[PDB]
Design a protein around this nucleic acid. Structure first.
Ligand SMILES: C[C@@H]1CCO[C@H]2Cn3cc(C(=O)NCc4ccc(F)cc4F)c(=O)c(O)c3C(=O)N12
Ligand SMILES: C[C@@H]1CCO[C@H]2Cn3cc(C(=O)NCc4ccc(F)cc4F)c(=O)c(O)c3C(=O)N12
Ligand SMILES: [Mg+2]
Ligand SMILES: [Mg+2]
Ligand SMILES: [Mg+2]
Ligand SMILES: [Mg+2]
Ligand SMILES: [Zn+2]
Ligand SMILES: [Zn+2]
Lengths: 47, 261, 66, 242, 261, 47, 66, 242
DNA sequence: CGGGAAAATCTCTAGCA
DNA sequence: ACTGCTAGAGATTTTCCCG
DNA sequence: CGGGAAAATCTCTAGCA
DNA sequence: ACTGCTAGAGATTTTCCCG
């Protein structure tokens, strides 16, 4: 599996780790504490 | 360096050293230093250094609102051509957005709309209007204007032309319509040296024409190809290459090891 | 009958992009068109392109200059 | 190139137009247009028709592209020159509008409508609009119950007319037809541009007299001398500007 | 096209058409169309698409103030190395800025300072302090933070490290000093895989050493060179090339057509 | 001579034409109605 | 006496930039240093560089790895 | 490479240090350091000295880099552990501070100063500082009239001492000297890194027994066998990790 | 000489507000 | 007469290690 | 085949707020 | 499961025009 770290939409603080649920060209889908979220790959890091 | 990793760990627990500092200092391999930085949550602070690519299928429009001199200008762009349609509306409300979209879809073929999450767009009215006229609503990632870069740049350009012409009109709505005319027919460039009006006409006519031609080809050209595997429909062949579609998976194979029946 | 159709499809110019390159790649040459993928010819190199990434025109203009 | 004589014979047998030659025997459009223009025996997309209609005590402004029957309509607050002018300015910024045909009225014969027409480069001229207003009203009645305010029913009828009704030769919509007509018109204007570009040159070949330049290619130069199109190699010809 | 230019002029007076639209439409040469656009004041709306380059001589520092949790952090960077010095001050005043600069110039050799035009920097106090310690004050173009890009990026980086360490300290000033330590000694990269502390030491020692070596060479190596022209001091020679300095104009000439005396 | 057109520091509106007084790498010095000004080449156009 | 000085000047590495390129150009080789211009050797190509654009170091770690 | 024997003879004649060999006969520093380390008969930059001084009813914190005499000073509100710790944390983030030598006092022997020393990796130890405080006070008196508040005169005296006073061997400032000393120290730590890297390998050449790897180049491998440095071609040798 | 692996170099982004 | 930069994250291209 | 001139292509930026 | 873009301004590199 992968850990995801991500800037949320407006908040400047980086959150994570979250699970990777889906990876596209341009965006990812992550799960952080039962909270599905869609983040730009610009605002996210997958390990 | 088995001993240094422990020292590099306790140190990073304090200074959070990049991989190069720990590799230099505690004499670690670059992979081990990178592994130490990689497991610290307090250092995962930067995203990927690329950009996505927005959709450009001939049926997708990007809509946004924008503000100029106290008024709200509602703007659409056809993504593939750069063709804009704008209008000074009196309020960023769902009623004025659903009426604008109903007019757009009655003029041009609109399949998908791409907007941000402002309330006028996430309305039940805009939704029932899109439903009535078979339009699919895409919402970008919240607070990601990059997902709508086309319409955002067109906001920039529309407002630049509006500034150029504003003195030729009394009211803002007239300036806005003149700027739409000017962007659509009086500015040439892009892929075919086109104006946005000519370019959209080309994109729509080409779409109609090629869909027709292909319906005809596939009605006539009926063949099954075996390559390397099972049967596969033949798409196009020529110049020592035979593009086929097997199990909804298009692939190009060389002419050898490929028999047509 | 059919070869006329193939060559006419052939007259249509395809601008397109790849996964990570922001630059649009010069007019290729339309070989086949489907509901979601386009098959083109870019400098004697056959590529398949997602529809969502390909702008297809005729270039009325290049055409009337021959 | 080699089939120029065959194209000349074709035109003397069926009087077909330049597009047919260009599509058949593979010739540049200027050369086909020249072949079709050499026989004297062988000798719209921008006109819109405007009119107002009244419905349930409100006025609908209707513009019909005559060549296609494509319709653009909206409800307007009042039959004024301001509203007719704003309508016209919207229409011309969205479709190439060259000429508007209106009835003798006030809104249409107004200094503000005249000023909008002048700014947009539109010429004015004072039974299509009547029949297509009838069809508009029919659709507005067919869908009235699906919308509260009248303007929504007017735009729903515009949508249905432009895209859900089908007829004619091969069953196309008004949107399909206007797109094809405007596309043919862009082709036409482009070929006119190419002619207007090349006709300012003269050619000297093998020297002989002056000769009109038609097409200029990689290893050939198609010209015209004494009403007879002829191909010469580029190295053996000289092109000047006059 | 002499006739079209008049039509292209009256039209541009209305729509302001880019050069391509007018060239396409009125059949004008590209140079003539560009000349029409070029003489309309209402179309000169875009600057040059490049960036300048900030100075990096070993004696120049960039100073800025920045804000974090209600406090004012005064920051300096040595441009050539990336070496930072920061301090939570109580007020963006000239007194607290002149005292900070007096301390910097007593620690490191400071020749020029580059700041924006905020009041703490354009003070008479900062000016008399810079005068006392022979420092030259450069002020960038007003509202051009690009001229101070180095210190601005260092603001970004300082605040990122401060966020990483903030929980290890009670007060902000302690977090700030720890972040200065961390940036100066616990982050390696750049030109010589250096930390900013090592890099500044190298830049200063190199400057001292090479100035000395050259004083010695020029005291010993005394020659006049004639090339192609009059006499010219010889700077360095080798590998079929002789760099000379004539009339305060350095030039490299090939070994041929150049005689040393 | 050259005409200069330039965004001023904060105002978004483009001004000009002004005379070129000096051109460097990165910036220009302009005169607009007896008002010497130093503009970034990013915010200026010389004709 | 003097050649030692020349070669020692020669050991010093020069990073530098040109007029419109934002990228720093790899370590050249210091040939001469003045109050405002530096003369270097970048891949058998002698250039003169404004001082304000040249960062000069030794690379203490390259030196001690020889 | 060829002059390794000459360097060996040189060390047996004058007992010079590895830097001399490396600068003279052109040898990698590890090989020179090995030559100088083979003779038993031939066998600071981070120490600071802290102390407080009182002046006009205010306390000055003074830190002197002993190896150079370079001084860092400021006025502090009070002789507390908080202020000594904040001073120390500033000093270590700006100069590489390994060891601080203080007198037996309260501020210096405090859990907060101890915590700052521990966070920054500084060792503590409980007539240089006295003389250089005297000189500091002399300059503070020389410049007092040029500044109203005492802290400005303290920083002006720091400036003058670190950069305007000159003495010693060749007349250098304390800033010049500390920069040279820290630069020598970075060189030293780098050579120590290179040794600590290479000494984890063994070499087999021509096979013979194990041999310590010294330098590894393009077309040569300098090793050591039976206390005798020897050069072998790379193709004829094999390097492993142990 | 040649793959595989490692390292160096290149490309590109956010934030500095 | 003055001027975008920095450091990390993936991608690409050199460099190296031994058969 | 070869310079010179023109055109096409490349590189890069602000604003969208 | 989604995604920066656009149009102009200088710079650079192809393409062309005739000796
Ligand atoms: C309340 C709705 C919904 C939720 O969010 C807000 C706020 N917002 C902010 C911007 C904006 O920041 N544009 C600057 C920009 C920056 C980068 C880039 F690539 C493109 C760009 F346009 C918009 O454009 C926009 O339409 C909105 C909006 O509509 N809303
Ligand atoms: C009152 C003083 C003097 C006059 O102007 C103001 C306002 N200002 C604004 C920014 C700012 O907008 N930074 C964002 C940014 C954008 C682009 C870029 F390349 C670098 C960047 F930092 C500053 O950083 C800053 O120090 C100030 C300041 O000090 N002042
Ligand atoms: Mg919006
Ligand atoms: Mg927007
Ligand atoms: Mg500032
Ligand atoms: Mg700032
Ligand atoms: Zn960490
Ligand atoms: Zn204009």
């Amino acid at each position: 599996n992968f850990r995801v770290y991500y800037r949320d939409s407006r908040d400047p603080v980086w959150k994570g780790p979250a699970k990777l649920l889906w990876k596209g060209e341009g965006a990812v889908v992550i799960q952080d504490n039962s909270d599905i979220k869609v983040v730009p790959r610009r605002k996210a890091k997958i390990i | 360096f088995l001993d240094g990793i422990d020292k590099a760990q306790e140190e990073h627990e304090k200074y959070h050293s990049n991989w190069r500092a720990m590799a230099s200092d505690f004499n670690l391999p670059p992979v081990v230093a990178k592994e130490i930085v990689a497991s610290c949550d307090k250092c995962q602070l930067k995203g990927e250094a690329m950009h996505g690519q927005v959709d450009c299928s001939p049926g997708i429009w990007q809509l946004d609102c924008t503000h100029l001199e106290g008024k709200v200008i509602l703007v659409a762009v056809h993504v593939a051509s750069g063709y804009i349609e704008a209008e000074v509306i009196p309020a960023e409300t769902g009623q004025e957005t659903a009426y604008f979209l109903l007019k757009l879809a009655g003029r041009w073929p609109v399949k998908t709309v791409h907007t941000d999450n402002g309330s006028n767009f996430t309305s039940t009215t805009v939704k029932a209007a899109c439903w009535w006229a078979g339009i699919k609503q895409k919402f970008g990632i919240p607070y990601n204007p990059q997902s709508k870069g086309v319409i955002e740049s067109m906001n920039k350009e529309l407002k630049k032309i509006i500034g150029q012409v504003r003195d030729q009109a009394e009211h803002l709505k007239t300036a806005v319509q003149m700027a739409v005319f000017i962007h659509n027919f009086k500015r040439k460039g892009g892929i075919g040296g086109y104006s946005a009006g000519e370019r959209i006409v080309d994109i729509i006519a080409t779409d109609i024409q090629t869909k027709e031609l292909q319906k005809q080809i596939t009605k006539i050209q009926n063949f099954r190809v075996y390559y390397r595997k099972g049967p596969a429909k033949l798409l196009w062949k020529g110049e020592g290459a035979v593009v086929i579609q097997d199990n909804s998976d298009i692939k190009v194979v060389p002419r050898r090891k490929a028999k047509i029946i | 009958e059919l070869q006329k159709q193939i060559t006419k499809i052939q007259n249509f110019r395809v601008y397109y992009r790849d996964s990570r390159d922001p630059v649009w790649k010069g007019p290729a040459k339309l070989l086949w068109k489907g509901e979601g993928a386009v098959v083109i010819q870019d400098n004697s190199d056959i590529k398949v392109v997602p529809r969502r990434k390909a702008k297809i025109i005729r270039d009325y203009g290049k055409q009337m200059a021959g």
